[model samples]
Target: MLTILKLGGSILSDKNVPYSIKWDNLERIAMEIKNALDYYKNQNKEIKLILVHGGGAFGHPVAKKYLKIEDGKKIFINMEKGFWEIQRAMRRFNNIIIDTLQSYDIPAVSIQPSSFVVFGDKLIFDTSAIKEMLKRNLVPVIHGDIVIDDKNGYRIISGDDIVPYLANELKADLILYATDVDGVLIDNKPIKRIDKNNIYKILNYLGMKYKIEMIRKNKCRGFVFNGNKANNIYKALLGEVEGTEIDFS
Candidate 1:
């Protein structure tokens, strides 16, 4: 089974702006992944995991603010420079993750989506290299990238967008989204089951725009777990009840 895990950046960096990478949580998270992999192996499950982390306090607000780029509009110079800075921050974070994974004896490699995966202005998918990496069991560590567009010049590529595309292309059995929150809360309550039919209603009630976009675009099944918890990764790997499960059907 293939699992696509998206590690949120808020957990990776400070709460303040101009975010710096948090090494303490990063180390704990990596150890948890390594432990999960070992446990899955013991269960005789052929688990192949692909990690796509959020740019966190690193890129999101910066790109959003500097370029005034919202909703997917791409401005030429600001968008380009913004994306460059975003990529640089992503690379730095990716290296931290890759190094940590390797320390645990997990054979992982970093794959930048911007290097191959192209996208249209409206965040249209162009997944070419993603399939190749999955086939080889290479953990493609992707992030919210600054994608070059033929028509619009450049735009930010969100991991939320990439998650479903990777899921569909790889036929992923499970997609795990780790965030700072407890799960999708509606009126301060946690939502349990969210399928295709009821997702819109739930989003509308909860006012979650980013997550709603994922469901609308890809129709992929996933879960939202509290990333601050060190053991949540293992829980997702084990198919245990820990986060909000998104039902596609």
Candidate 2:
């Protein structure tokens, strides 16, 4: 089974925490990924994992400083410094993710999105490299990044957006968001099912503010589950878990 899994920034790091990542969550998520691999492999099912993560404690804060982009068409506002700072943070975060996965012998490698990706107002990345990586049984660890944009100076490519983009590109069997929350809450409980037909009703309760539009446009369905809970990711992978299925099917 080929799975495109996105670990939310909130799950990967405590946004409230100062400039560092959430180690506890990092370790826990890594373990579950390992377990998922082992669990499926034992069942003689090879899981091709394309892992994408958010830039939580690291990228957001730095990028926030430069969020207000200029309107000058060909004239960039000396954004090189700010752009590099944002890139620095995202790259650092990506390395941490790759290292943690590699620690579990997961054969993880970093495929930087910003290096080749450009944006008019959103994400633009190539799929060929990612495809080749999976073909070699290598986990191509990707993350949100800052990209150059003629329309908006520089814009952010979030993991929330990246998950489905890659999902569509790779023709992944599943697109999943392992987030901090139990699921999208409604009526004091997590709604277990959401689709394009009624997704607007629960959009506010969802984590990513920009996700719904992308989900609708991309025509990709996603499943949202609590990455906070232990073994949840593993179970989600095995189809034995209960979580919100954001179906566009």
Candidate 3:
């Protein structure tokens, strides 16, 4: 099965602390990846995995310095230096994640998005290298990074955006989003499922960003599981886990 896992920045790092990494969290995440791999190998199940992560504290704090939020929209200021700073922050964090995953004997490689991604109204990215990596059993670790945009000169390519697009374009069977929280919460409790049916109500309520439109348009379903807990990744991949399963159906 082909699976796309998005390790949320908040799950892997201290979103409140600049450049602060949650090493323990990362270590456990790697273990979960390793466990899932071993489990699948034992089951004789072929697995294709890709990882995408958000900016968390590493990229967002630096980016916040240059972009202002007004009426639910980001207004980028005329700060070219801020662009460089944001990219540097994101790259540094990306390297940390890649290195950590590799330490667990996972063949994780970095695919820098900015090098090959361009933004028109949406993203135009080179997926040749990414596809090749997967074909070779290499896990291509991607992250939210600053990419050049004809509209804004440069902008953040969010992991939220990447996961859905790739889930569609790459023809992934499942999309797993690992976040700090349990799942899509209703009254501060995790809900078992979500869909276009009630995603709007859920989104109107709280914290996690459910890209329902994109996921629905792509005709894919995704699960948002808690990354803070161990074995969640392994179980989710095995279809024995529960969180918020967002289906296009």
lDDT of 2: 0.78
**Winner of 2 and 3 under TM-score:** 3
The candidate scoring highest on lDDT is 3
Residue-level lDDT tens digits of model 3 in 1-249: 789998988888887788899989899899889888888879998888999998888887888888887688888776668877887888899888998898899999997887778887867987888898888889999999888888867778898879988898899988998887788778988888877677778766753654656777788988888888878877987766558888775
Q: Which regions in candidate 2 have their CA more than 4 angstroms from the true location?
A: 69-77, 121-123, 203-209
lDDT per residue, candidate 2, 1-249, as tens digits? 688888988887888874777888888888888888888879988789989887888876887776554574333344667778888998898888889888988889997777888877455677888788898889988888887776766667778767877777777888878887787667667777777657776675554447756766777777778988888888887766457777776
Q: After TM-score superposition, what is the CA distance of residue 205 in candidate 1 from its true location, in Å?
A: 2.0
Q: Count the backbone clashes (under 3 Å) in each candidate.
A: 1, 0, 0
Give me the displacement of residue 70 in model 2, in angstroms.
7.6
lDDT, candidate 1, 1-249, per-residue tens: 888888887777774766687888888888888888888778887778888887767675566555653567645455436666777876776787788878887778887766665666454555556567667766678777777776766667777777777787777888888888878777776678777677658766652468656655677777887989879877877777666777674
* CA-lDDT, candidates in order: 0.74, 0.78, 0.83
Residue 208's lDDT within candidate 1 is 42
Clashing pairs in 3: none
